[PDB]
C-alpha cells in the first residue's frame, strides 16, 4: 500500500502503474482535440512531435502513458493562451483516471503573483514535464525538467550551432556580456537588477535597461547578436520565471552559460551533466562570479564550449528533440536494467540516437571505443541482398559470418558489431574488403564505402537534388558496398518513423540514401569514401522528404578520398 | 530540531557565504572536539572517520574559516543510540544555528518498529551522509548516500582474481529476512536448482542445508549475488559483495544506492523490483558476458576506491560535497568512475566537437630557418601563391645573421632552438598552422591547398606529407625508425604539415617529462615529439597526403617517458577524388 505517498511525494513506485507498460515499450496516447478549444502554436508543435514519434498509439487500451490534448502549456491567467475551466474539462474525461500514467507538459505555469508552481487544475498522480521547476517542488525520477522555448522555436530540425573558428585561446573579444531587463518593484529580478557592481565598461559589460537614463544610453550601443558572438561567457540569470529564452540562445552561440538561477533544475538534469557544459553559480556570490570565470583554465573553457555546442545540437535545437528527450527520460524510468548510462547522454552523439533496448553496454555501440580504452571489433558479418562475390568475401581474415528494408533489420543471427553490405553485382575484391574494414576500424562511427554520390541545391526550383556524376566532392556513401556498425540497423528499425520506411518499401528504393541521412544525423560527419573505383525523380522526392522530416540537411560534403599508402 | 526539513536544498538551506572562492578550490571540514555528553562511546569506525578527515587536506582547525562541519557524536548506527538527548547534544554544538552546514555520518538508520530510512533523531537542517536512503526521505542534491561499512573489508583480505567464469551464476547469501523473501528464493531454486544457491546458518560464517560456507569467500565463487534489504534498505552486505567482485542485484525498492550522484551504478549493479522474484534469473540471463565482466570490474574498483575503509567513504563524501559546491572546478566523470587500469588506456580528445571549418579563414604558415637564404626565398615565393594562405610569417632562428600579398611578418627569435616553431604566437589568427621547412622546395601550392582542404575535415588531427614509421625490434628489445617506402604510416614530419593551432599550446605548455627541453638541447627529433603528443592526446591516427643523434634513440626515449606507444599504425592516405 502506498496511499500516504501520493501528491507532492509521488514517485514511480507509488504513482505509476508498470503493468500497463508492457514489453512493447512506452506507448503514449494523445487525447482527441475537442472542437472549439484554445490551443497554442507551441502546443500544436509538441502534439505533432508526439504524433510523429514512434511512441504514438491511437488506442488508449494499448497505451502506457497519456498526454492531454488541451492547452496546458500556458497556465497564466493574464496570458491570452490561457484555457478556462481546464479542471472541469479534464475531470469530465473518463480516461483521466486521477492522472495515473499521465504526462502534463507545461511552460508558463503561474500568474503575476510569485509565479508559483500552481498549475491551476488538479493533476492527481500525473508526471509533470514542467519548465523552470524548482528543486523544492521537484519530484526526482518522477518529474522531468524541460527547456523554456518560444513560439518561433523550430518544430523540427533546428539551426546549427553558431560556433565556428575554434580559435586558441578560446576566449573571444569580450568575457562577460549581458543584455536584458530589470523587472522593477516585484518578485524576481534580484540579480539582473544588481548586475552593475560587476560592470566596468569592458569585457564585463552587463548592460541592463528599464537610475535608468545611463543604463538606457549604454544599452543602445552594441548589438545583442554582436555581443553574443563576441563573448566568452553569457549569464543566464533568473527573472519572473526560473528559466528564460537566453539559455538556448547562449547554448546555440556556444557562449558558455553561467547559471545565476538558484534552485533551477537545468533541462534534463536527470540525465545531462551540466558541469561539463556550463558554469553553475549561486546568485549569492555574484561579486565573486567574475573572478571564478577568470580562474577557469583554457582547456576547461574549450571543453565547455564544445560540450555546449554538442548539447545544443543534440537535445535543444528543436521542439521535437525536447519532446523526444522527455519521452526517453520517462521511458528509462521503467526498466532499470534497460536504461542508459550517465555517459550515453553526456557525450557524442547523444541519448536520442542511442537506444538502451538494443544494449545498455557502451561497448556495443561504435561511439565510445576511445572512452573505454577498447578497440573496434576485428570481425565483421557479411550481409548480401554473387558466388564470386561470396568467395571473395570469404577469403578474408575478418569475415566471421556470411548472411527493401529487410537488409536493415536487427537480426539476431549476427554476432559481430560490424556489418559489410553487398548487392548482386558489387565487384568487391578481398583486398578491397580488408582495406575497407581497416579504415572502418579507424573510423567506426562513420560509413566507409566505395560508391559515393552528392547532393546539390536546385536554386532554380528551391529544392534538393541527387547527383551521381563524378564531381569534385561527395556527401553520401551508398549502403550497398560499405562497412558500418550493426547498431545502425537497429536504429533504422527503431528510430525512423513508420512513414519513411513505408514509402521506402513502396517505391523499392532510397534505402541507402535514408541510411546515409540517419548516420550523418548521428555522427554529424561526412561519410568516408575509399579508393578511386567509381564504376531519378524518386530519389529527389526521397531527399526532399528526408530533409522535411529531419528539419534540416544532415549531409556534409567531403573532398578527400582515402587510399592505400603507396 | 524539527525532525529534518525534507524540503531543504543547497540553495535554500545550505550556507555558501562562509565558503567562498579559495584558489585551490578545496572545502574546509572542521571537526568538533570530543565531549563526554553525559552519550555512547565512540566506535572504532567513527574514530577512523575522524582520523581520515583530519589527515586529508579537507581538514581545518579554524572554526571561523570552515566550509563544512562534523560533530563528534557517533551516529553511525542509532539502533544502539537513545534517539534522544543526542539531538540535545547536536543542538548544543557551537555554531549550530539550525545545523545548516553540519554533516552527519550514519550507516544504519531507523529502529523498532517502523524502521525509518534517515536518522530518526531530530536534525532540522543537516547535511545527512547516510545509508539506507529512501526516494521519499532523500533530499536529492543535498543528502549523500553512503554505504554501510562491513568489517569484512578490513578483517578479511581475499585474492583479487580478475573477472571471468564462476562456478554458480546466481547466489543468495543472507541468513533470513522476512520469510516471504526466502519463500520466493526457494521457489527460484526449486526449478533450476544448479546455479541458484540459497544458504543460511547453522558474523564470519554462513551455512547451507548441511554444508558450511566461509564468509565472505563464498561470494567470490558466484558471479551474481542477490542482495535483499529486510529490515532496512541499507545493508552492510554491499561492501562484502563488492570486495568479492560480485555484481550487486539490489531488491530494495526506492533505495538510493550509495554514491549514486557521482558514480554510474547502472554499469555496476542491477536493480530489480521486489515484485519480479519469479523471473529475476531471466533478467540476469538478458545481460551478456561482456557487460557482466565490465560490471564486475566496476564493482571491484568501487570497493577499492569507496568501499574499502571509512577513509575512502569520508574522502568520497567530502569530494562529492566539494563537487556540488564547486561545479566549475569539480572532478570529472572519468575520475569518479574509471579504475586506473582503464583510466590509463582511455582517451579524452580535447577537440571532440565534430565541426568542419569554412573555406574562408585560411591557414597559417610558420617558417623557421637559420641560414638558407636561397632555399628560404624559393620556399616563400612558392608558398605565396596558394589562395588559402591567410598569412605567412617567418621565424629567424639565427642570432649572428640578421633579417635582410599576405602579411610577411618577421619576428627575430631571441634564442636558437627548435621549439620556437611551436610557440602559441598571438600573430596566428587562424586555427590551421602549416609547419614548413626550407628543404621542402619540392611542394607546389596545389598540394598545400589540398592539404588545407583535408585538414578542414579533421581539424584535430595531424595532416602532413612526409610519412614515417616506427617498428619494434624484439631482438634489440627497442623501437626503430623507418623512413623508407613502407606499407604503414605512424608519423608525419613537421617539415610539411597542417595541424591545429592548439597543438602549439600543447607542445610549449604541456609536455610529458622533459621532452621539450631535452629535444631542444639536442639538434633533431622534434618532428617525432609532436606526433607522439598528438597521438597521445587525441587517441587518433595521422593523415599522410600524397606520396612525399640517432632517431631510434629518441623514439625509444619518447616511448619510455610516455609509458606506452601512443602512435597508431594505419595503412590509409588521403588523396583527391579527382586525382588523375
Ligand atoms: C598517454 O600518455 C599518458 C601519460 O604519459 C599515459 O598514461 C600512462 O600510462 C602508463 C601505461 O599505459 C602508466 O604506467 C603504469 O604505471 C603504474 C604505476 O603508476 C604501473 O603499476 C602500471 O603497470 C603501468 O606501468 C602511467 O602511470 C600513465 N601515466 C603517466 C603519467 O605516465 C597513457 O597511457 C598514454 N596513452 C596512450 C594511448 O598512449
Ligand atoms: O537586447 C535584447 C533583449 C532581449 N532579447 C530577447 O529577449 C528574450 C529574453 O530577454 P528578456 O529579459 O526580455 O526575457 P526574460 O529573459 O526575462 O524572459 C530572448 O528571446 C532574447 O532573444 C533580445 O533578443 N535582445
Ligand atoms: C565582433 O565585433 C566586430 C567588430 O570588432 C564585428 O564586426 C563583428 O560582427 C562582431 N561579431 C562577430 C565577429 O561574430
Residue numbers in the entry:
A (entry chain A): 89 to 298, 311 to 485, 497 to 514, 546 to 677, 698 to 728
B (entry chain B): 78 to 115, 123 to 286, 296 to 497, 506 to 649, 671 to 702
Text taken from the publication that reported this structure:
Heparan sulfates are complex polysaccharides that mediate the interaction with a broad range of protein ligands at the cell surface. A key step in heparan sulfate biosynthesis is catalyzed by the bi-functional glycosyltransferases EXT1 and EXT2, which generate the glycan backbone consisting of repeating N-acetylglucosamine and glucuronic acid units. EXT1 and EXT2 are predicted to share a common architecture with a N-terminal transmembrane helix anchoring the enzymes in the Golgi membrane, followed by the glucuronic acid transferase (GlcA-T) domain and the C-terminal N-acetylglucosamine transferase (GlcNAc-T) domain. Here, we present the cryo-electron microscopy structure of human EXT1-EXT2, which reveals the formation of a tightly packed hetero-dimeric complex harboring four glycosyltransferase domains.
Single-particle cryo-EM studies on EXT1-EXT2, in presence of both UDP-sugar donor substrates and divalent manganese ions, provided a three-dimensional EM reconstruction with an overall resolution of 2.8 Å. We de novo built an almost complete model of EXT1-EXT2, only lacking the presumably flexible N-terminal stem regions (residues 29-88 in EXT1, residues 47-77 in EXT2) connecting the catalytic Golgi-luminal domain to the transmembrane anchoring helices, as well as several short, surface-exposed loops. EXT1 and EXT2 form a tightly packed 1:1 hetero-dimeric complex with a total interaction surface of 3523 Å2, suggesting that EXT1-EXT2 complex formation is essential for protein stability. The N-terminal glycosyltransferase domains of EXT1 (residues 89-435) and EXT2 (residues 78-419), supposedly harboring GlcA-T activity, adopt a characteristic GT-B fold architecture. The C-terminal glycosyltransferase domains, formed by residues 479-728 in EXT1 and residues 455-702 in EXT2, feature a GT-A fold and potentially harbour GlcNAc-T activity. The GlcA-T and GlcNAc-T domain of EXT1 interact tightly with each other, while the two domains of EXT2 are only connected through a potentially flexible hinge region. When analyzing the GlcA-T active site of EXT1, we found an additional EM density that fits a UDP ligand. The UDP is bound by several charged residues (Arg280, Arg346, Glu349), through a pi-stacking interaction with Tyr324 and a hydrogen bond with Tyr319. Surprisingly, the active site of the EXT2 GlcA-T domain displayed a different topology, with an anti-parallel beta-sheet intruding into the donor substrate binding pocket.
